[PDB]
Design an enzyme around this catalytic site. Sequence first.
Site, PDB file in Angstrom:
ATOM      1  N   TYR A  88       0.830  -1.232   0.000  1.00  0.00           N
ATOM      2  CA  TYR A  88       0.000   0.000   0.000  1.00  0.00           C
ATOM      3  C   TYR A  88       0.858   1.273   0.000  1.00  0.00           C
ATOM      4  O   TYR A  88       0.256   2.375   0.043  1.00  0.00           O
ATOM      5  CB  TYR A  88      -0.980  -0.037   1.170  1.00  0.00           C
ATOM      6  CG  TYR A  88      -1.894  -1.236   1.179  1.00  0.00           C
ATOM      7  CD1 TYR A  88      -2.972  -1.324   0.310  1.00  0.00           C
ATOM      8  CD2 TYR A  88      -1.693  -2.282   2.066  1.00  0.00           C
ATOM      9  CE1 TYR A  88      -3.825  -2.414   0.324  1.00  0.00           C
ATOM     10  CE2 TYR A  88      -2.537  -3.379   2.092  1.00  0.00           C
ATOM     11  CZ  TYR A  88      -3.605  -3.444   1.216  1.00  0.00           C
ATOM     12  OH  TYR A  88      -4.455  -4.507   1.195  1.00  0.00           O
ATOM     13  N   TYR A 472     -11.528  -1.676  -0.484  1.00  0.00           N
ATOM     14  CA  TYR A 472     -11.626  -1.121   0.886  1.00  0.00           C
ATOM     15  C   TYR A 472     -10.273  -0.549   1.315  1.00  0.00           C
ATOM     16  O   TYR A 472     -10.258   0.153   2.335  1.00  0.00           O
ATOM     17  CB  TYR A 472     -12.123  -2.188   1.860  1.00  0.00           C
ATOM     18  CG  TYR A 472     -11.025  -2.989   2.505  1.00  0.00           C
ATOM     19  CD1 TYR A 472     -10.443  -4.073   1.866  1.00  0.00           C
ATOM     20  CD2 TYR A 472     -10.538  -2.628   3.752  1.00  0.00           C
ATOM     21  CE1 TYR A 472      -9.411  -4.784   2.462  1.00  0.00           C
ATOM     22  CE2 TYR A 472      -9.511  -3.325   4.361  1.00  0.00           C
ATOM     23  CZ  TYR A 472      -8.949  -4.406   3.715  1.00  0.00           C
ATOM     24  OH  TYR A 472      -7.934  -5.028   4.371  1.00  0.00           O
ATOM     25  N   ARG A 473      -9.193  -0.836   0.576  1.00  0.00           N
ATOM     26  CA  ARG A 473      -7.819  -0.412   0.945  1.00  0.00           C
ATOM     27  C   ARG A 473      -6.941  -0.336  -0.301  1.00  0.00           C
ATOM     28  O   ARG A 473      -6.987  -1.283  -1.115  1.00  0.00           O
ATOM     29  CB  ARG A 473      -7.251  -1.426   1.931  1.00  0.00           C
ATOM     30  CG  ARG A 473      -6.094  -0.900   2.758  1.00  0.00           C
ATOM     31  CD  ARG A 473      -5.665  -1.971   3.732  1.00  0.00           C
ATOM     32  NE  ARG A 473      -4.337  -1.725   4.261  1.00  0.00           N
ATOM     33  CZ  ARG A 473      -3.711  -2.543   5.085  1.00  0.00           C
ATOM     34  NH1 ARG A 473      -4.305  -3.659   5.479  1.00  0.00           N
ATOM     35  NH2 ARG A 473      -2.498  -2.242   5.515  1.00  0.00           N
TER      36      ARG A 473
HETATM   37  C1  LIG Z   1       3.482  -8.014   1.589  1.00  0.00           C
HETATM   38  C2  LIG Z   1       2.349  -8.434   2.509  1.00  0.00           C
HETATM   39  C3  LIG Z   1       1.607  -7.473   3.205  1.00  0.00           C
HETATM   40  C4  LIG Z   1       0.549  -7.829   4.064  1.00  0.00           C
HETATM   41  C5  LIG Z   1       0.255  -9.202   4.223  1.00  0.00           C
HETATM   42  C6  LIG Z   1       1.017 -10.161   3.530  1.00  0.00           C
HETATM   43  C7  LIG Z   1       2.039  -9.805   2.684  1.00  0.00           C
HETATM   44  C8  LIG Z   1       2.821 -10.873   1.959  1.00  0.00           C
HETATM   45  N1  LIG Z   1      -0.749  -9.654   5.041  1.00  0.00           N
HETATM   46  C9  LIG Z   1      -1.472  -8.758   5.671  1.00  0.00           C
HETATM   47  C10 LIG Z   1      -2.530  -9.203   6.512  1.00  0.00           C
HETATM   48  O1  LIG Z   1      -2.785 -10.391   6.705  1.00  0.00           O
HETATM   49  N2  LIG Z   1      -3.277  -8.238   7.139  1.00  0.00           N
HETATM   50  C11 LIG Z   1      -3.025  -6.906   6.983  1.00  0.00           C
HETATM   51  O2  LIG Z   1      -3.759  -6.132   7.594  1.00  0.00           O
HETATM   52  N3  LIG Z   1      -2.016  -6.447   6.216  1.00  0.00           N
HETATM   53  C12 LIG Z   1      -1.276  -7.329   5.577  1.00  0.00           C
HETATM   54  N4  LIG Z   1      -0.229  -6.900   4.770  1.00  0.00           N
HETATM   55  C13 LIG Z   1       0.024  -5.448   4.646  1.00  0.00           C
HETATM   56  C14 LIG Z   1       1.027  -4.884   5.679  1.00  0.00           C
HETATM   57  O3  LIG Z   1       2.192  -5.695   5.776  1.00  0.00           O
HETATM   58  C15 LIG Z   1       0.452  -4.710   7.089  1.00  0.00           C
HETATM   59  O4  LIG Z   1      -0.835  -4.115   7.012  1.00  0.00           O
HETATM   60  C16 LIG Z   1       1.345  -3.886   8.027  1.00  0.00           C
HETATM   61  O5  LIG Z   1       1.004  -4.144   9.389  1.00  0.00           O
HETATM   62  C17 LIG Z   1       1.243  -2.395   7.812  1.00  0.00           C
HETATM   63  O6  LIG Z   1       2.475  -1.756   8.276  1.00  0.00           O
HETATM   64  P1  LIG Z   1       2.510  -1.089   9.721  1.00  0.00           P
HETATM   65  O7  LIG Z   1       1.772  -1.975  10.674  1.00  0.00           O
HETATM   66  O8  LIG Z   1       3.907  -0.691  10.063  1.00  0.00           O
HETATM   67  O9  LIG Z   1       1.614   0.214   9.470  1.00  0.00           O
HETATM   68  P2  LIG Z   1       2.109   1.715   9.266  1.00  0.00           P
HETATM   69  O10 LIG Z   1       2.772   1.750   7.925  1.00  0.00           O
HETATM   70  O11 LIG Z   1       2.896   2.154  10.462  1.00  0.00           O
HETATM   71  O12 LIG Z   1       0.720   2.529   9.210  1.00  0.00           O
HETATM   72  C18 LIG Z   1      -0.121   2.521   8.018  1.00  0.00           C
HETATM   73  C19 LIG Z   1      -0.821   3.853   7.827  1.00  0.00           C
HETATM   74  O13 LIG Z   1      -1.803   4.077   8.880  1.00  0.00           O
HETATM   75  C20 LIG Z   1      -1.773   5.421   9.313  1.00  0.00           C
HETATM   76  N5  LIG Z   1      -1.164   5.487  10.635  1.00  0.00           N
HETATM   77  C21 LIG Z   1      -0.384   4.532  11.254  1.00  0.00           C
HETATM   78  N6  LIG Z   1      -0.014   4.878  12.466  1.00  0.00           N
HETATM   79  C22 LIG Z   1      -0.602   6.123  12.663  1.00  0.00           C
HETATM   80  C23 LIG Z   1      -0.594   7.008  13.755  1.00  0.00           C
HETATM   81  N7  LIG Z   1       0.039   6.754  14.896  1.00  0.00           N
HETATM   82  N8  LIG Z   1      -1.281   8.167  13.625  1.00  0.00           N
HETATM   83  C24 LIG Z   1      -1.933   8.399  12.479  1.00  0.00           C
HETATM   84  N9  LIG Z   1      -2.015   7.640  11.386  1.00  0.00           N
HETATM   85  C25 LIG Z   1      -1.313   6.503  11.543  1.00  0.00           C
HETATM   86  C26 LIG Z   1      -1.025   6.159   8.221  1.00  0.00           C
HETATM   87  O14 LIG Z   1      -1.955   6.366   7.183  1.00  0.00           O
HETATM   88  C27 LIG Z   1       0.040   5.123   7.864  1.00  0.00           C
HETATM   89  O15 LIG Z   1       0.649   5.450   6.620  1.00  0.00           O
HETATM   90  C1  LIG Z   2      -2.005 -12.534   2.306  1.00  0.00           C
HETATM   91  C2  LIG Z   2      -2.945 -11.507   2.823  1.00  0.00           C
HETATM   92  C3  LIG Z   2      -2.587 -10.054   2.569  1.00  0.00           C
HETATM   93  C4  LIG Z   2      -3.434  -9.056   2.984  1.00  0.00           C
HETATM   94  C5  LIG Z   2      -3.267  -7.720   2.619  1.00  0.00           C
HETATM   95  C6  LIG Z   2      -4.168  -6.775   3.078  1.00  0.00           C
HETATM   96  C7  LIG Z   2      -5.219  -7.181   3.883  1.00  0.00           C
HETATM   97  O1  LIG Z   2      -6.103  -6.263   4.352  1.00  0.00           O
HETATM   98  C8  LIG Z   2      -5.380  -8.535   4.238  1.00  0.00           C
HETATM   99  O2  LIG Z   2      -6.417  -8.935   5.039  1.00  0.00           O
HETATM  100  C9  LIG Z   2      -6.413 -10.313   5.511  1.00  0.00           C
HETATM  101  C10 LIG Z   2      -4.478  -9.451   3.780  1.00  0.00           C
END
Ligand SMILES: *Cc1cc2c(cc1C)nc1c(=O)[nH]c(=O)nc-1n2C[C@H](O)[C@H](O)[C@H](O)COP(=O)(O)OP(=O)(O)OC[C@H]1O[C@@H](n2cnc3c(N)ncnc32)[C@H](O)[C@@H]1O
Ligand SMILES: C/C=C/c1ccc(O)c(OC)c1
Lengths: 523, 525
Positions: A88, A472-473
Site C-alpha cells: 500500500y 476497501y484499501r
Molecule cells: C506483503 C504483505 C503485506 C501484508 C500481508 C502479507 C504480505 C505478503 N498480510 C497482511 C494481513 O494479513 N493483514 C493486513 O492487515 N495487512 C497485511 N499486509 C500489509 C502490511 O504488511 C500490514 O498491514 C502492516 O502491518 C502495515 O504496516 P505497519 O503496521 O507498520 O503500518 P504503518 O505503515 O505504520 O501505518 C499505516 C498507515 O496508517 C496510518 N497510521 C499509522 N499509524 C498512525 C498514527 N500513529 N497516527 C496516524 N495515522 C497513523 C497512516 O496512514 C500510515 O501510513
Molecule cells: C495474504 C494476505 C494479505 C493481505 C493484505 C491486506 C489485507 O487487508 C489482508 O487482510 C487479511 C491481507
Amino acid sequence: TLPDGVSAEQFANAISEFSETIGSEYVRVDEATVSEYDDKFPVTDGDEFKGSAVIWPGSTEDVQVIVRIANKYGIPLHAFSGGRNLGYGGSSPMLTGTVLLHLGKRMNRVLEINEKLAYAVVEPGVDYKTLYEAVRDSGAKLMIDPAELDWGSVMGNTMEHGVGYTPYADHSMWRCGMEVVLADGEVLRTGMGGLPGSEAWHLYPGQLGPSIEGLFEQSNFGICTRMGMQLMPTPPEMLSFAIYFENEDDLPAIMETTLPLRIGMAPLQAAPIVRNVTFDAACVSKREEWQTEPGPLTDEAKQRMVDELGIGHWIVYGTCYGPRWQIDKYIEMIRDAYLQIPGARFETNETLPLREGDRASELLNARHELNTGVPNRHSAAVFDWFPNAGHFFYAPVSAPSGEDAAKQYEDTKRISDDHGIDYLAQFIIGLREMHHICLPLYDTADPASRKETLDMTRELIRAGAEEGYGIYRAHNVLADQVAETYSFNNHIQRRSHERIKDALDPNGILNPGKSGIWPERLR
Amino acid sequence: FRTLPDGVSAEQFANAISEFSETIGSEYVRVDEATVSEYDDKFPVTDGDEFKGSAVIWPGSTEDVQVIVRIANKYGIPLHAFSGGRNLGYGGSSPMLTGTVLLHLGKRMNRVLEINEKLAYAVVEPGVDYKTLYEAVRDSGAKLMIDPAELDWGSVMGNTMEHGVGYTPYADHSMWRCGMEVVLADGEVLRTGMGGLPGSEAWHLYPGQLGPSIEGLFEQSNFGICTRMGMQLMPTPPEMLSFAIYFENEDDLPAIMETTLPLRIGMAPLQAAPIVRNVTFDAACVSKREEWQTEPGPLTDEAKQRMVDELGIGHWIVYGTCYGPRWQIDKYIEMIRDAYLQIPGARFETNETLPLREGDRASELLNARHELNTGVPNRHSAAVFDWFPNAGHFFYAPVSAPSGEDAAKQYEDTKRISDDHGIDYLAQFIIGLREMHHICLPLYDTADPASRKETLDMTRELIRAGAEEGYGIYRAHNVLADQVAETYSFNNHIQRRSHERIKDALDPNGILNPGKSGIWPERLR
Ligand SMILES: *Cc1cc2c(cc1C)nc1c(=O)[nH]c(=O)nc-1n2C[C@H](O)[C@H](O)[C@H](O)COP(=O)(O)OP(=O)(O)OC[C@H]1O[C@@H](n2cnc3c(N)ncnc32)[C@H](O)[C@@H]1O
Ligand SMILES: C/C=C/c1ccc(O)c(OC)c1
Ligand SMILES: *Cc1cc2c(cc1C)nc1c(=O)[nH]c(=O)nc-1n2C[C@H](O)[C@H](O)[C@H](O)COP(=O)(O)OP(=O)(O)OC[C@H]1O[C@@H](n2cnc3c(N)ncnc32)[C@H](O)[C@@H]1O
Ligand SMILES: C/C=C/c1ccc(O)c(OC)c1
C-alpha cells in the site's frame, strides 16, 4: 526533494525549529536516512511519493510541537507507527517533499497488560512480535491477533482497517481508547478517556454523543500516540485444519459451503482463508523450481505445485477454539460439509504435524501459528519467489457467493496473464462479506514490471467497479482512482470526508490526498 | 402558534409553514395544539415551555425529507427528526430547543424494505418497530431472529441511533447496523460505506469503504436524518434455554459481579450479557407499589422483604440465556449453575424448571426475559408505568469497569441519594464483556411538579457523584445534556469542541436539533 509551494528557506526555517524543539539527532535530512522511508515496493519510477525528511519524536509533547511548526510553515506531514505498509506504499507520503514522522522508532513501549479485563495499551512502535513476547512474559492467559508479518505495528495495522485470522481478526473492532494529537497540535482522548479518573477508556468505545475513533482510519485527521487493544482470553484448546481441493473449478462450491458454516459464528469460529496453490507454493519454494520461461504460469506448472507439494488447487485454512467437546463437534461438522466436494482432503495439525522436509506441514503450521496468536514471518518467503519479488494489492469486497468469487478469479487471472504478472489469491468470508485479496508478484527493481503492474491493477479497478466490487484499501498511487468509484450522488462520500478534513485540518497539513481526501487549499 | 424558535418572528415562522405545506401538502404539516401536544415529553421533569415543539411534519419519502431540510435552511428554523419518537426516559419526542419543528419520519416511512435470509439482514424505514419487524420476519419463514429492547413499540432505526441495546448476543444495535441512507443538513443524500458504489451488493454486508466510516457520527448527534438502514440479524440457533438466579441478601451484589466477569469476558458460557435486577424492578413488572407499601416515603426494608418473599424471588435476580445445539446448552447451563450456586442462598431455575403458569408471577417475570433474550418482542416491562398513577422514569446510566467493588459503591450511593429525594430506585446492572452499564430507573409522579423537581435534583446529584468516582453517562435526557457533556472535561472539553467542529462542517446553518449531547451550532455559542 521539496513540497510544492514551499521555498528552500521556508523549508530550512521549519527544519531548524524542528531541530531546536526535538534535537537535531532526531530530525534527519541526510539522503541515507530519508531514502529508507521511500516505498520499498514502488510501481512508479521518478520523484512521486518521496519524503524530504523524517523525524523520530519520543513523546506526545514532541508530536504536538512538530505539528504546530508544520502549521506555522504550512509543511505537509505524514505520520506512521511502523512504516511497513508493504503493498500500500509502506512509509511513502502522498505528496513529494512531505515531512515524515516515524513514531515507532522511539515511542515503542507496551504501557499496560491487564489480565482481569483482557486488553493492553501500546505505543506506535509495539509490533506483533513485541506484544506477543510482552504478554507471554506477563503470564496473562491472553492471545494477540497478528497479521501475516510479525513486524507490523499493532496500532498502525489498526489505522488501515487491517485484519488478522483469530476470532479477534477485525482489529478496528477491538481497538478501544486512542490518545490522538489533532491537526492543530491539541491532544484528544477518545471515548471514556475524555472523563477524568475513568477506568473505562479501554473498556467501552462510547461517550455522550458520537464516537470519532472510526474517523481516524485510512484518514489524515490526527496522529495516534497511544491506543488500547482488546485481547481474546486464551481458550482451553485450539485445533487447526487444512482442506485440499483438486480443481480450480471447486472455487464456487468452497464459497457456497463456507457461508452457512461461518454466518452463525459456528462451527467456523474464525474467518477461514481460501488461497490458490500459487500463494502456498510461493511460501515454501521459488518460482524457478516449478517453471523456467518468464511468461505467465502455465496449467502444467500449477499442476506440478499441487502434485509435488501434496496440496490442492485451492486450500482452506481454519481453526476451532474451546474445549475438546466443542472442537470435536465443530471439527466433525467442518470435515463433514467440505468433503461433499469430490476429491477434497482434510488434515489437522495433529494428522499433518510439523515434520522436516514436509512443506505442506510447514505451511499448515504457519496458519496454525497465526490462528493461535503466534506471530511469524513465514509469508516473507514470497519475497524470494523470484529476485526482488514485491506486491501491489487489489483488494475488493463483495457478497460471499459461489460465482461472485468465480468471476473475480476468472477475470483476475485473465488480466494478470495479459500483463505476464503472477496472481496469488486469498479469499476470506468475514461473516456476511467476502474479501478478495489479489497479491501480484512483480519485479520491484525493473521499470517494465512496475508499469505492467500499475496498468494491470488500474484495469482490475475498472473491472471491479464495473461488476459492483469496491476496494476497501489502496496503495497511494490508486487512492484517487478508487475514491472515484464511490461515485453515488457526485461522490457525496469523498465530499463528506473533505468537509470533516477541513473541520479537523483547516490548514491541510496531514498527508494531503490520503484515501482521496484532499484539503480545501489543494482543490 | 403554541411556541416559537428564539429569533424567529410569528410571520417569519408562518411563511416557513406555508412552504412546508406547499411542497409536502398541508395535511402533513400540523401546528394545532391537539396534534403537536401529542409530541411533548410524556415524562417531563420541567413545568413550562421548555422542550416544546412548534409543529410536527409527516414526510412520506426521503425526497420529502430533503425538501423540508432545504426550506429550514432558507427560513432558519431548527428541526428535530426522530423515527418513532418514543425515546421515554430520555425526552420522548421533545427537542432541545423550544419552538423546534419536529419531523416524525415513522408515521408514513414505516415499510420493511427487505428480509435477506441467505445473508441474514433486513432493511427498514424509520417507522418499523420491533413488533412489526418480528411479524415480518416470521411471515417470511426466514430462520432469523431480531434483537429488541424492552418495549416492542421502540423503532429498530431510532433505537440504534440512540446507541440503545437489547439482550441477545446481538445486544449492541449500533454494532449490527450496516448501510445507512442519510439526508444531510443541506438536503443532500449520502449512502454510507459500500452504498457509495453503484452496483454494490455489500451496502448492508461490510460496514466499510475506502477512507473513514462515518456511520458512527449519526449516533447521539444532530448531523443528519436517516431515511433507511440495514440491520444484520442473528441466525436462529437449534435451541435456546433461559435461566433466572435468585440471591438472598441484597449484599450478594459484589459476589454476583465477580462470578459473572470470568463467565462473560470469553463470550462463553455467558453467550449474551446477563442482567442483574434488584427486587423493586421485578416487582413493578408484575405488581403495584401499594400492594407492599401504602406510606408514600422511600420503600422500607420490610416492603422489599415482602416483595422478595411473596413473589418468591431474591433481593437480586440474574437473567440470562444459552444458544446452540442441546449438547452445548447443557454444558454451558451447568458451568453457570455451579459458578453462581457457590453464593450461599442462591437458587437457579430455567424456563423448563419454572414454566409459565397463571398466577406464578416468578414464572411470568422469567417468561418475559426468555421472550426478549430469544428475540420475541413484548410490552411486559410497560407494567412499570402502573407502579403508581402517572409513574414515569428518567434514566441515570453510567458506565464503569466491571467490578463487584464498583457495583456495591454505585448501588449504595444511588440508593442513599434516591432515598434523600423520596424517589423509588429500580436498579439493573448489565455486564457487556469488559464493561458494566448501571441502569438507574427512577419512578416518579410525572403529573406532580414537586416530584419532577425532586427527580431532576436527584439526577443532577447522581451525575456529580458518578463524575466524582470516574463513572461516565453514555446516554442522557435532553435536560441533562449540558451537565453530562461537561463531565467529559479532558483538555478544556476537546471532545465537545471536536463535536462542534464537525457539527459546523456538516450543518453550517445549525438547523438540526441544536444542543443534542452538548453539540451546539456555532451561531448559539
Ligand atoms: C506483503 C504483505 C503485506 C501484508 C500481508 C502479507 C504480505 C505478503 N498480510 C497482511 C494481513 O494479513 N493483514 C493486513 O492487515 N495487512 C497485511 N499486509 C500489509 C502490511 O504488511 C500490514 O498491514 C502492516 O502491518 C502495515 O504496516 P505497519 O503496521 O507498520 O503500518 P504503518 O505503515 O505504520 O501505518 C499505516 C498507515 O496508517 C496510518 N497510521 C499509522 N499509524 C498512525 C498514527 N500513529 N497516527 C496516524 N495515522 C497513523 C497512516 O496512514 C500510515 O501510513
Ligand atoms: C495474504 C494476505 C494479505 C493481505 C493484505 C491486506 C489485507 O487487508 C489482508 O487482510 C487479511 C491481507
Ligand atoms: C421507559 C423505558 C425505556 C427503555 C427501557 C425500559 C423502560 C421501562 N428499556 C430500554 C432498553 O432495554 N434498551 C434501550 O435501548 N432503551 C430502553 N428504553 C428507552 C426507550 O424505550 C428505547 O430506547 C426506545 O427504543 C427509543 O425510542 P424510539 O425507538 O422510538 O426512538 P426515537 O425516538 O425514534 O429516536 C431517538 C432519538 O434518536 C435520533 N433519531 C431517531 N431516528 C432518527 C432518524 N431517522 N434520523 C436521525 N436521528 C434519528 C433522535 O435524536 C431521536 O430523538
Ligand atoms: C430496564 C432497562 C432500561 C434501559 C434504558 C436504556 C438502556 O440503554 C438500556 O440498555 C439495556 C436499558
